[PDB]
Design a protein around this ligand. Sequence first.
Ligand code: CL
Ligand code: CL
Ligand code: CL
Ligand code: CL
Ligand code: CL
Ligand code: CL
Ligand code: CL
Ligand code: NA
Length: 129
Amino acid sequence: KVFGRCELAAAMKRHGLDNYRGYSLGNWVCAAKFESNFNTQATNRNTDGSTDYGILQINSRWWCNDGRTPGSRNLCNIPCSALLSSDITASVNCAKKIVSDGNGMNAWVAWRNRCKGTDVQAWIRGCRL
Ligand SMILES: [Cl-]
Ligand SMILES: [Cl-]
Ligand SMILES: [Cl-]
Ligand SMILES: [Cl-]
Ligand SMILES: [Cl-]
Ligand SMILES: [Cl-]
Ligand SMILES: [Cl-]
Ligand code: NA
């Protein structure tokens, strides 16, 4: 599924990401835009041989099992394929664990390089939330 911007904002808010660990909703939408272009089916291989899955590009090195990432963990206890669903529940629940892990949203390279320090409220401008 390719979400609309405000559609995704609404879904993320419903799932309690608005100000989760202090990150306003615009941060999450911005991260999703640059990670996946709001596409739940996005997959991208990393240099280390791991793969990033779904709307928030969650990595198989640490977070989900994809059966082909040697020496990896599965700390969200989920098959990576579940992160590609049109239902973002699994992605959001796993993201909550990631952002709580010590480094905040800096775990998302694209957030650090493209969203941090910017006017992230722009990403929810015009949305009925
Ligand atoms: Cl957009
Ligand atoms: Cl915001
Ligand atoms: Cl594996
Ligand atoms: Cl393969
Ligand atoms: Cl594990
Ligand atoms: Cl959803
Ligand atoms: Cl933080
Ligand atoms: Na893994």
